């Protein structure tokens, strides 16, 4: 029932920082987590990190621990059980190996063991 | 092993009980009536569909005279009447001496001193300085205290008087009386079954049917009709002491009109325009009357005397010629029509072969009072405000109120006169089929089972 | 009285005598174009829809 | 198919005992519509209860109904049968109350004429019912004073 | 033989605990006679309740009584003891409340002076009573989430 | 630590089911202070209830609250769950009501949106709930007619 819209794609030369925006709707943005994952061209795709829109606690892979800054905009209420929000993703040092497809996803359940597990994905974006 | 008691909660058991019923108005909001109608606008709406659950095999004893639902409804009607009269204008200062003279009845009408022309030397405030106004009064409302044509309104030395608000309407609307949960209303649906006795055919309802509070004295109006044969109700003793209740299967029609074209006059009495009165009539002077088809009334009276010798059980001389009166409410068919209170000579209906015949439709002369003492015990009387224009209402006559003149003369005497019985008898006439009971849902019975284990 | 018609807004004044049980209309600078049939009409709008009966 | 409210009042005691929930419901769904006050919330505020004592009088009738419910639930409570509609007890059936056998009672009699036949000894049975529990109270009393 | 309503108020706690049904009855047989309104049905209609606010005032007193009953039955309900007059719980007895041994409590003290000695910690005990159930709620919660 | 009255209204159904006692208490501790009439006993007698129908009107509001409590306790009673806050039944779950799995229901949904999703079939479920018991009534009926 929810939807995850992603920002427009753009190519920037290595060395500079960038920002991806993932806009939400069709659910309660503070209920489910937000995951960011990359599909590497030539190798296996790797999970990058997740952050809670409500708790604000963030946990990243050690492969992107000191290279990624996540931020979650405060949700905007729509219905009695639907809100809209914005999730932002950032990289500090750019390189040629950073080229690949990127996706933003939401959580499956609110509690339990499969809380932060990606469930609903965005359309994706392409890089340098 | 042995036999053990076991508790049952919710068994179909009831006992005769009197409980507090409440009102319910049909869910129309009565928007087409322009004010409140017996102040029953503010009353819980009926369910869109009522649930009537038939009770197979059930036979219950009914007593319409011991039902008390009648006494409850009676007090409810009385209190509603008072609640609607309380805020209205009381005519305490209007009991000043009136100088009145007689005015001629017309040469087409029975020369009577009726509709008296009265002038008022009464002052309302200092501003008025004893203004002289004139009003039209029916003869019954006024009495000649002192000669030289000096008059006062009747009752004024006995009690106060209050004027019915012009806005409020006296039209009876159907009211469903409902019992609270844990109580129930039992409805006998046998059409021919007399009012009291064991009813083989019983249904249960949360609320009764729509009962119209028709104010009447001699004949019942706008009620419900018994199916198949007409019904005749007396108490067990039946010997000149009760009041005979009659419920017809076919309704007779009665049209009552007041041809006089009344108007309005003498508005302000109190601070601001507070009181309505009757201007001079416009057009002819005709007295009020009611027609009843002579053919249908002779047929109905015939079927009545057939059922009288039926319930009586013994061939006997049953006459109607005579009629006897106490006060006014028993000599006349008292009732209400459009807000004016009519009192009608019924002697033409209660004679002996009165027809021929002599008229296509029997006509009864009716006089009119604006001062009435229905439920006004000793203290507070009511002035019905005058109605502008000609008045005409059509009424269903569904029932009757009679009284015997039982007399051990070896079946020679036995005369039935139209009593002017109490209004509660009117409620008994429509509550005969209903009854109030309380549910006792706790039954204990042995099924030889024991809760050995505890906890 | 909140509003009148914008065409005749400055020349129309509707008053309301509460206790006198009436309400009045005033129209200044009468012209031959204002020759017409006048009515007074009532209507009830309820933001709540919260009454004993239904209104018109 | 369910005969309706009080439908089995003329049926055998066993048949009514099968539809005791039906009679149990009219204790609640008469009083759910009145406590609702949803159709009462807007009609002339609270059905004009000022200068109308019928309104209070009406209210007192509603009070009597919930008061009667509380009487029956209290009796089920002090007999240790609160949660159940059918409970068995420890009180033995004294034959002086009724001499009828089980088949004649449950397959030949209705609850009405039964309640009429035993209305004489109802208070005595209730006394044994209030008393018998007291032996359970005492067994729990043995477990209390160790 | 039964001492009567509140008869064992000066008896040892064990003796009153044997006749708790007696004290339980005055909650119902005061309120059965008033809800009856059988002796009230005919006397001047409903005891003239028009222009008599004592009638309403009286009615409000009847309301307070059934309201208090509902408070106690609610407490028995949320402690899982609705159907029983004596129930044991899972809450252990903290010694700070009272240091008296069992024999001194049940065979030397009355319920009055006991309730006076423990009125200080009643709220705490109720809190453990509302809390302890919550571990049963949680065991049922384990059975719910499988 | 306990979130407070209605605190877990936005929590998962499992979390609120852990603190249902909290929501249960506001049924009683709103109505304990009003039935108390201790702070009401002396203030101008009974808060001048003569010529003040707001006093009666107020009283009628108190009546509606205890009347609603009696509706819920009646439903728990006729479902044989009077003494317990969590009870399991015999009624099987028809899938047409909701197709969601257990993990998605108890760890992904709140009681509000659940009650909104199932408000359509609540009456049907209650009917099965009033009906299913009737098979227990019938088993007890087999034990009654021997
Ligand atoms: C002994 O006890 C038994 C057991 O209780 C008594 O039997 C009961 O008697 C009741 C009254 O007669 C009867 O009520 C019937 O209700 C039926 C369904 O109720 C709904 O509908 C009626 C109106 O009926 C119309 O609509 C339905 C559909 O809703 C149609 O199917 C009908 O054909 C009608 O078009 C509503 O008023 C209710 O509120 C419900 O919404 C009805 O079918 C039935 O109506 C017929 O009888 C009426 C007179 O009672 C009549 O006015 C109506 O028009 C129907 O008449 C039919 O035949 C005439 C012939 O001329 C025709 O012109 C009509 O067009 C129509 O076809 C009743 O209203 C109970 O159902 C019934 N119960 C049982 C178990 O039998 C019994 O009376 C009693 N007797 C004694 C002596 O003790
Ligand atoms: C109001 O009071 C009356 C009292 O008069 C009461 O009527 C009793 O109703 C109960 C049930 O509600 C009856 O109790 C059971 O009846 C079982 C018999 O039911 C079947 O058989 C009936 C007899 O048929 C005979 O005749 C036909 C030829 O016509 C023949 O083929 C048959 O083999 C048989 O010999 C029959 O009337 C009945 O009704 C249907 O069928 C007939 C056609 O057969 C049709 O005409 C009807 O219109 C209707 O469609 C049905 O077929 C009886 O067997 C049972 O005893 C045991 O057996 C069954 C197994 O069958 C077990 O399941 C059961 O548990 C028992 O152990 C039991 O006696 C009782 O007999 C009635 N008493 C009468 C009529 O006097 C009403 O119910 C009451 N109502 C309320 C609401 O209170
Ligand atoms: C109000 O407060 C007072 C407190 O003062 C309280 O009185 C206590 O009452 C309880 C019971 O209600 C007593 O508790 C039990 O008492 C048992 C003894 O009862 C028998 O023995 C009594 C002593 O008799 C001695 O003297 C005679 C010679 O006179 C001698 O033969 C006997 O052998 C014995 O030595 C006796 O008073 C008592 O009363 C009847 O009998 C005497 C004659 O004997 C007669 O004069 C009296 O008028 C009366 O008819 C009776 O005979 C005691 O045994 C028991 O301890 C255990 O033993 C029994 C077995 O016998 C077990 O069943 C029991 O469960 C125990 O395990 C227990 O102590 C208590 O002693 C009283 N305390 C006093 C008096 O100080 C009131 O009850 C309170 N009332 C209320 C309403 O609260
Ligand atoms: C309102 O709605 C929101 C929905 O957004 C809801 O938030 C959910 O809250 C529930 C619990 O109330 C969560 O459900 C459980 O969460 C368990 C995890 O809790 C721990 O881990 C969190 C993640 O930390 C990661 O990151 C750190 C680095 O920062 C890393 O070290 C960790 O290892 C981990 O990778 C953490 O946020 C959380 O909070 C405390 O700790 C962090 C630091 O770690 C601190 O910053 C916080 O401020 C805070 O102090 C805590 O540490 C999860 O494990 C569990 O799943 C299973 O595991 C546990 C065992 O740990 C089992 O006991 C459990 O039963 C499960 O089987 C379960 O998922 C849910 O995740 C939230 N959802 C979110 C945030 O989206 C609110 O509660 C709602 N509130 C109301 C009132 O309704
Ligand atoms: C037993 O049952 C019978 C069932 O019929 C009961 O008899 C009924 O009684 C009621 C109440 O008494 C009557 O209602 C009255 O109807 C009158 C009919 O008048 C008609 O014409 C009026 C004048 O017409 C002109 O004006 C209108 C606009 O208003 C124009 O459209 C028209 O062309 C003319 O130019 C109309 O005003 C009216 O709408 C009718 O069309 C009403 O006049 C009358 O209103 C008066 O009374 C109201 C209540 O007091 C009051 O509020 C009003 O202001 C007004 O004074 C009222 O509505 C039924 O007509 C009558 N049924 C009949 C005659 O068949 C009977 O009462 C009952 N009980 C007993 C004991 O018998
Ligand atoms: C009970 O009795 C009352 C009397 O109190 C009757 O009411 C009167 O009814 C008559 C009709 O029978 C009315 O007379 C007619 O009035 C018409 C309306 O007049 C008003 O409107 C005009 C037009 O705007 C104004 O100019 C005028 O000033 C009034 O404000 C007139 O149009 C009539 O005149 C026409 O007809 C007559 C013949 O009828 C012709 O001779 C004339 O030339 C002209 O063509 C007529 O005057 C009378 O006004 C009413 N009285 C009052 C006080 O209003 C009730 O009708 C009666 N009840 C019933 C049921 O009939
Ligand atoms: C509250 O709001 C009202 C209207 O919403 C304002 O009232 C308006 O005031 C303006 C002036 O600012 C009026 O406009 C002017 O009206 C003059 C008078 O018009 C009347 O008289 C003439 C001659 O008798 C008639 O022909 C005409 O039909 C009217 O009956 C005109 O003379 C003016 O015309 C001239 O000036 C304008 C520029 O202002 C030129 O463009 C024209 O060509 C011409 O030279 C002008 O039309 C307006 O009429 C008023 N409204 C209404 C409805 O009448 C109030 O001012 C405002 N409140 C406050 C405090 O200002
Ligand atoms: C009291 O007197 C009044 C008269 O003032 C009288 O009211 C009228 O009763 C008749 C019944 O005979 C009503 O007419 C019927 O109304 C029903 C309901 O809408 C219609 O369905 C009927 O139409 C069918 O029946 C006709 C034959 O009767 C067929 O010809 C027709 O084609 C249809 O099949 C029929 O019209 C009449 O409406 C009322 N009048 C008013 C104003 O309501 C009343 O009956 C008397 N009281 C009693 C208890 O009888
Ligand atoms: C209605 O009719 C019944 C039945 O006829 C009347 O009750 C009867 O009264 C006579 C005389 O006292 C007895 O012999 C019968 O045994 C009674 N039968 C029943 C069924 O009660 C009853 O009095 C009548 N009610 C009226 C006329 O109002
Ligand atoms: C009494 C009455 O109704 N009207 C009188 C009138 O008869 C009298 O001629 C006049 C002289 O003051 O005073 C006024
Ligand atoms: C009177 O009625 C009784 C009983 O019906 C009957 O036996 C007797 O013959 C009747 N007598 C007369 C004179 O009608």
Short mmCIF file of N, CA, C and O in Angstrom, two decimals, chain B residues 3-15 20 22 41-45 47 51 53 55-58 76 79 83 181-182 439 441-442 444-451, chain D residues 3-6 9-10 20 23 26-27 31 33-34 39-40 43 47 51 54 58 61 65 68 72-73 75-76 80-81 85-93 102 106 112 114-115:
data_model
loop_
_atom_site.label_atom_id
_atom_site.label_comp_id
_atom_site.label_asym_id
_atom_site.label_seq_id
_atom_site.Cartn_x
_atom_site.Cartn_y
_atom_site.Cartn_z
N UNK B 3 -28.62 -36.89 43.62
CA UNK B 3 -29.16 -35.81 42.81
C UNK B 3 -28.55 -34.52 43.33
O UNK B 3 -28.44 -34.33 44.54
N UNK B 4 -28.16 -33.63 42.42
CA UNK B 4 -27.56 -32.38 42.84
C UNK B 4 -28.21 -31.20 42.12
O UNK B 4 -28.55 -31.29 40.94
N UNK B 5 -28.35 -30.10 42.86
CA UNK B 5 -28.90 -28.87 42.30
C UNK B 5 -27.90 -28.27 41.33
O UNK B 5 -26.68 -28.34 41.53
N UNK B 6 -28.41 -27.66 40.26
CA UNK B 6 -27.58 -26.98 39.27
C UNK B 6 -28.23 -25.66 38.90
O UNK B 6 -29.45 -25.60 38.70
N UNK B 7 -27.42 -24.61 38.81
CA UNK B 7 -27.91 -23.25 38.58
C UNK B 7 -28.04 -23.01 37.09
O UNK B 7 -27.15 -23.36 36.31
N UNK B 8 -29.15 -22.40 36.69
CA UNK B 8 -29.39 -22.04 35.29
C UNK B 8 -29.65 -20.54 35.23
O UNK B 8 -30.57 -20.05 35.90
N UNK B 9 -28.86 -19.83 34.43
CA UNK B 9 -29.00 -18.39 34.29
C UNK B 9 -29.58 -18.10 32.91
O UNK B 9 -29.01 -18.52 31.90
N UNK B 10 -30.70 -17.38 32.87
CA UNK B 10 -31.37 -17.06 31.62
C UNK B 10 -32.51 -17.97 31.21
O UNK B 10 -32.69 -18.24 30.02
N UNK B 11 -33.29 -18.46 32.17
CA UNK B 11 -34.43 -19.34 31.88
C UNK B 11 -35.64 -18.49 31.50
O UNK B 11 -35.86 -17.42 32.08
N UNK B 12 -36.45 -18.92 30.52
CA UNK B 12 -37.66 -18.15 30.16
C UNK B 12 -38.72 -18.21 31.25
O UNK B 12 -39.69 -18.97 31.14
N UNK B 13 -38.54 -17.41 32.30
CA UNK B 13 -39.47 -17.31 33.42
C UNK B 13 -39.79 -15.84 33.65
O UNK B 13 -38.90 -14.99 33.64
N UNK B 14 -41.07 -15.55 33.88
CA UNK B 14 -41.51 -14.19 34.15
C UNK B 14 -42.57 -14.21 35.23
O UNK B 14 -43.23 -15.22 35.47
N UNK B 15 -42.73 -13.06 35.90
CA UNK B 15 -43.76 -12.86 36.90
C UNK B 15 -44.45 -11.53 36.64
O UNK B 15 -43.86 -10.61 36.07
N UNK B 20 -41.76 1.08 35.50
CA UNK B 20 -41.83 2.40 34.89
C UNK B 20 -41.59 2.29 33.39
O UNK B 20 -40.48 1.96 32.95
N UNK B 22 -41.59 4.08 29.52
CA UNK B 22 -41.16 5.37 29.01
C UNK B 22 -41.77 5.59 27.64
O UNK B 22 -42.29 4.67 27.00
N UNK B 41 -42.56 15.58 21.16
CA UNK B 41 -41.45 15.77 20.23
C UNK B 41 -40.14 15.30 20.85
O UNK B 41 -39.32 14.65 20.19
N UNK B 42 -39.94 15.60 22.14
CA UNK B 42 -38.73 15.21 22.85
C UNK B 42 -38.97 13.83 23.47
O UNK B 42 -39.30 13.69 24.64
N UNK B 43 -38.79 12.80 22.64
CA UNK B 43 -39.11 11.46 23.09
C UNK B 43 -38.41 10.46 22.17
O UNK B 43 -38.43 10.64 20.95
N UNK B 44 -37.79 9.45 22.77
CA UNK B 44 -36.89 8.53 22.07
C UNK B 44 -37.52 7.96 20.79
O UNK B 44 -38.65 7.45 20.83
N UNK B 45 -36.82 8.02 19.66
CA UNK B 45 -37.39 7.49 18.41
C UNK B 45 -37.53 5.97 18.42
O UNK B 45 -36.72 5.25 19.02
N UNK B 47 -37.42 2.14 17.01
CA UNK B 47 -36.55 1.40 16.12
C UNK B 47 -37.14 1.32 14.71
O UNK B 47 -38.36 1.27 14.55
N UNK B 51 -38.83 -5.85 16.89
CA UNK B 51 -38.71 -7.31 16.89
C UNK B 51 -39.84 -7.83 17.76
O UNK B 51 -39.88 -7.59 18.97
N UNK B 53 -41.37 -11.40 18.80
CA UNK B 53 -40.96 -12.80 18.84
C UNK B 53 -42.17 -13.59 19.32
O UNK B 53 -42.63 -13.43 20.46
N UNK B 55 -44.29 -16.61 20.73
CA UNK B 55 -43.98 -17.57 21.78
C UNK B 55 -44.91 -18.76 21.60
O UNK B 55 -46.08 -18.73 22.01
N UNK B 56 -44.39 -19.80 20.96
CA UNK B 56 -45.16 -21.01 20.71
C UNK B 56 -45.55 -21.62 22.05
O UNK B 56 -44.74 -21.64 22.99
N UNK B 57 -46.78 -22.11 22.15
CA UNK B 57 -47.24 -23.02 23.21
C UNK B 57 -47.57 -22.24 24.48
O UNK B 57 -47.92 -22.86 25.48
N UNK B 58 -47.46 -20.92 24.49
CA UNK B 58 -47.49 -20.14 25.72
C UNK B 58 -48.89 -19.61 25.95
O UNK B 58 -49.50 -19.01 25.05
N UNK B 76 -49.28 9.93 32.97
CA UNK B 76 -48.36 10.53 32.00
C UNK B 76 -49.06 11.59 31.17
O UNK B 76 -48.51 12.68 30.96
N UNK B 79 -49.76 14.69 33.43
CA UNK B 79 -48.55 15.47 33.68
C UNK B 79 -48.10 16.19 32.42
O UNK B 79 -47.61 17.32 32.50
N UNK B 83 -47.46 20.11 32.07
CA UNK B 83 -46.17 20.63 31.62
C UNK B 83 -46.35 21.56 30.43
O UNK B 83 -45.57 22.51 30.26
N UNK B 181 -35.05 -3.05 29.79
CA UNK B 181 -34.50 -4.40 29.78
C UNK B 181 -34.67 -5.07 31.13
O UNK B 181 -34.65 -4.43 32.18
N UNK B 182 -34.87 -6.39 31.10
CA UNK B 182 -35.21 -7.14 32.28
C UNK B 182 -36.69 -7.18 32.56
O UNK B 182 -37.14 -7.97 33.40
N UNK B 439 -38.67 -10.47 34.32
CA UNK B 439 -38.01 -11.74 34.08
C UNK B 439 -37.26 -12.19 35.32
O UNK B 439 -36.45 -11.45 35.88
N UNK B 441 -34.73 -14.82 35.72
CA UNK B 441 -33.96 -15.76 34.90
C UNK B 441 -33.22 -16.84 35.68
O UNK B 441 -32.43 -17.57 35.08
N UNK B 442 -33.43 -16.97 36.99
CA UNK B 442 -32.69 -17.91 37.81
C UNK B 442 -33.53 -19.15 38.11
O UNK B 442 -34.51 -19.07 38.86
N UNK B 444 -33.12 -23.33 39.28
CA UNK B 444 -32.29 -24.41 39.81
C UNK B 444 -33.02 -25.74 39.67
O UNK B 444 -34.21 -25.84 40.00
N UNK B 445 -32.32 -26.75 39.15
CA UNK B 445 -32.92 -28.05 38.85
C UNK B 445 -31.90 -29.15 39.07
O UNK B 445 -30.69 -28.90 38.98
N UNK B 446 -32.35 -30.38 39.39
CA UNK B 446 -31.41 -31.48 39.63
C UNK B 446 -31.06 -32.23 38.35
O UNK B 446 -31.96 -32.64 37.62
N UNK B 447 -29.76 -32.40 38.05
CA UNK B 447 -29.33 -33.26 36.95
C UNK B 447 -28.29 -34.29 37.37
O UNK B 447 -27.60 -34.85 36.51
N UNK B 448 -28.18 -34.56 38.66
CA UNK B 448 -27.31 -35.58 39.24
C UNK B 448 -25.87 -35.49 38.72
O UNK B 448 -25.29 -36.45 38.23
N UNK B 449 -25.30 -34.29 38.82
CA UNK B 449 -23.93 -34.02 38.41
C UNK B 449 -23.29 -33.21 39.53
O UNK B 449 -23.90 -32.24 39.98
N UNK B 450 -22.09 -33.55 39.98
CA UNK B 450 -21.54 -32.66 40.99
C UNK B 450 -20.16 -32.14 40.62
O UNK B 450 -19.33 -32.88 40.08
N UNK B 451 -19.91 -30.88 40.95
CA UNK B 451 -18.57 -30.33 40.81
C UNK B 451 -17.72 -30.92 41.93
O UNK B 451 -17.47 -30.21 42.91
N UNK D 3 -35.25 -19.40 18.02
CA UNK D 3 -36.69 -19.16 18.03
C UNK D 3 -36.96 -17.69 18.30
O UNK D 3 -38.00 -17.15 17.92
N UNK D 4 -36.01 -17.04 18.96
CA UNK D 4 -35.99 -15.63 19.27
C UNK D 4 -36.09 -15.43 20.77
O UNK D 4 -36.16 -16.38 21.55
N UNK D 5 -36.09 -14.16 21.16
CA UNK D 5 -36.15 -13.82 22.57
C UNK D 5 -37.35 -14.48 23.25
O UNK D 5 -38.49 -14.28 22.84
N UNK D 6 -37.07 -15.25 24.31
CA UNK D 6 -38.08 -15.98 25.07
C UNK D 6 -38.86 -16.97 24.21
O UNK D 6 -39.98 -17.37 24.56
N UNK D 9 -40.14 -20.46 25.75
CA UNK D 9 -40.82 -20.34 27.03
C UNK D 9 -41.89 -21.41 27.21
O UNK D 9 -42.18 -21.82 28.34
N UNK D 10 -42.47 -21.89 26.11
CA UNK D 10 -43.41 -22.99 26.10
C UNK D 10 -42.82 -24.33 25.74
O UNK D 10 -43.56 -25.31 25.61
N UNK D 20 -30.64 -20.70 26.48
CA UNK D 20 -30.63 -19.72 27.56
C UNK D 20 -29.84 -18.46 27.20
O UNK D 20 -30.10 -17.39 27.77
N UNK D 23 -32.34 -15.72 26.04
CA UNK D 23 -32.96 -14.98 27.12
C UNK D 23 -31.94 -14.13 27.85
O UNK D 23 -32.30 -13.12 28.47
N UNK D 26 -31.46 -10.44 26.29
CA UNK D 26 -32.31 -9.24 26.39
C UNK D 26 -32.01 -8.40 27.63
O UNK D 26 -32.74 -7.43 27.90
N UNK D 27 -30.99 -8.76 28.39
CA UNK D 27 -30.58 -8.07 29.60
C UNK D 27 -29.63 -6.94 29.26
O UNK D 27 -29.53 -5.95 30.01
N UNK D 31 -30.38 -2.45 27.08
CA UNK D 31 -29.62 -1.44 27.82
C UNK D 31 -28.39 -0.92 27.07
O UNK D 31 -27.87 0.14 27.44
N UNK D 33 -28.82 0.03 23.85
CA UNK D 33 -29.37 1.11 23.03
C UNK D 33 -29.65 2.35 23.87
O UNK D 33 -29.58 3.47 23.35
N UNK D 34 -29.97 2.18 25.15
CA UNK D 34 -30.26 3.33 26.01
C UNK D 34 -29.01 4.04 26.53
O UNK D 34 -28.94 5.27 26.50
N UNK D 39 -28.36 8.61 19.48
CA UNK D 39 -29.60 9.13 18.94
C UNK D 39 -30.25 10.05 19.96
O UNK D 39 -31.20 10.77 19.63
N UNK D 40 -29.71 10.05 21.18
CA UNK D 40 -30.13 10.94 22.24
C UNK D 40 -29.17 12.11 22.42
O UNK D 40 -29.57 13.14 22.97
N UNK D 43 -30.68 15.24 19.96
CA UNK D 43 -32.08 15.65 19.98
C UNK D 43 -32.36 16.55 21.18
O UNK D 43 -32.51 16.08 22.31
N UNK D 47 -32.41 15.54 25.59
CA UNK D 47 -33.87 15.37 25.62
C UNK D 47 -34.56 16.25 26.65
O UNK D 47 -35.42 15.80 27.40
N UNK D 51 -37.04 20.88 33.83
CA UNK D 51 -38.49 20.99 33.96
C UNK D 51 -39.22 19.79 33.36
O UNK D 51 -40.42 19.85 33.09
N UNK D 54 -40.25 13.38 34.00
CA UNK D 54 -40.25 12.17 33.18
C UNK D 54 -38.87 11.81 32.67
O UNK D 54 -38.55 10.63 32.55
N UNK D 58 -37.69 8.51 33.64
CA UNK D 58 -37.23 7.56 32.63
C UNK D 58 -35.90 6.98 33.10
O UNK D 58 -35.68 5.76 33.05
N UNK D 61 -36.02 4.37 35.58
CA UNK D 61 -36.41 3.07 35.05
C UNK D 61 -35.18 2.34 34.53
O UNK D 61 -35.05 1.12 34.71
N UNK D 65 -33.30 -1.48 35.78
CA UNK D 65 -32.94 -2.60 34.92
C UNK D 65 -31.51 -3.07 35.20
O UNK D 65 -31.27 -4.26 35.39
N UNK D 68 -31.37 -4.81 38.55
CA UNK D 68 -31.81 -6.20 38.54
C UNK D 68 -30.73 -7.12 37.99
O UNK D 68 -30.48 -8.20 38.54
N UNK D 72 -28.85 -10.56 39.86
CA UNK D 72 -28.59 -11.89 39.33
C UNK D 72 -27.10 -12.21 39.25
O UNK D 72 -26.69 -13.32 39.61
N UNK D 73 -26.28 -11.27 38.78
CA UNK D 73 -24.83 -11.50 38.79
C UNK D 73 -24.26 -11.63 40.19
O UNK D 73 -23.26 -12.35 40.38
N UNK D 75 -25.93 -13.10 42.68
CA UNK D 75 -26.30 -14.45 43.06
C UNK D 75 -25.41 -15.48 42.37
O UNK D 75 -24.96 -16.44 43.00
N UNK D 76 -25.13 -15.29 41.08
CA UNK D 76 -24.19 -16.19 40.42
C UNK D 76 -22.81 -16.09 41.05
O UNK D 76 -22.07 -17.08 41.10
N UNK D 80 -20.46 -19.14 43.30
CA UNK D 80 -19.27 -19.56 42.58
C UNK D 80 -19.53 -19.97 41.15
O UNK D 80 -18.85 -20.86 40.63
N UNK D 81 -20.50 -19.34 40.49
CA UNK D 81 -20.86 -19.70 39.12
C UNK D 81 -20.84 -18.50 38.20
O UNK D 81 -21.61 -18.43 37.24
N UNK D 85 -22.79 -20.31 32.49
CA UNK D 85 -24.25 -20.30 32.47
C UNK D 85 -24.88 -21.54 33.09
O UNK D 85 -25.99 -21.45 33.62
N UNK D 86 -24.20 -22.68 33.04
CA UNK D 86 -24.66 -23.91 33.68
C UNK D 86 -23.56 -24.36 34.63
O UNK D 86 -22.44 -24.64 34.20
N UNK D 87 -23.88 -24.43 35.92
CA UNK D 87 -22.94 -24.92 36.91
C UNK D 87 -23.62 -25.92 37.82
O UNK D 87 -24.80 -25.79 38.16
N UNK D 88 -22.86 -26.94 38.20
CA UNK D 88 -23.30 -27.95 39.15
C UNK D 88 -22.75 -27.60 40.52
O UNK D 88 -21.69 -26.99 40.65
N UNK D 89 -23.47 -28.01 41.55
CA UNK D 89 -23.15 -27.61 42.91
C UNK D 89 -22.95 -28.86 43.76
O UNK D 89 -22.94 -29.99 43.26
N UNK D 90 -22.80 -28.66 45.07
CA UNK D 90 -22.66 -29.75 46.02
C UNK D 90 -23.94 -30.03 46.79
O UNK D 90 -24.00 -31.03 47.51
N UNK D 91 -24.96 -29.19 46.66
CA UNK D 91 -26.20 -29.32 47.41
C UNK D 91 -26.99 -30.52 46.90
O UNK D 91 -27.32 -30.57 45.70
N UNK D 92 -27.30 -31.50 47.73
CA UNK D 92 -28.15 -32.60 47.28
C UNK D 92 -29.60 -32.16 47.19
O UNK D 92 -30.05 -31.26 47.89
N UNK D 93 -30.33 -32.83 46.30
CA UNK D 93 -31.72 -32.48 46.01
C UNK D 93 -32.67 -33.16 46.99
O UNK D 93 -32.90 -34.37 46.90
N UNK D 102 -36.49 -37.50 36.48
CA UNK D 102 -35.72 -36.65 35.58
C UNK D 102 -36.37 -36.57 34.20
O UNK D 102 -36.46 -35.49 33.61
N UNK D 106 -37.51 -32.94 32.52
CA UNK D 106 -36.80 -32.29 31.42
C UNK D 106 -37.43 -32.52 30.05
O UNK D 106 -37.08 -31.81 29.10
N UNK D 112 -41.76 -22.48 33.10
CA UNK D 112 -42.77 -21.68 33.80
C UNK D 112 -43.46 -22.48 34.91
O UNK D 112 -43.42 -22.09 36.08
N UNK D 114 -42.56 -25.21 36.16
CA UNK D 114 -41.57 -25.67 37.13
C UNK D 114 -41.30 -24.59 38.17
O UNK D 114 -41.33 -24.85 39.38
N UNK D 115 -41.01 -23.36 37.71
CA UNK D 115 -40.77 -22.26 38.64
C UNK D 115 -41.98 -22.00 39.53
O UNK D 115 -41.84 -21.57 40.68
#
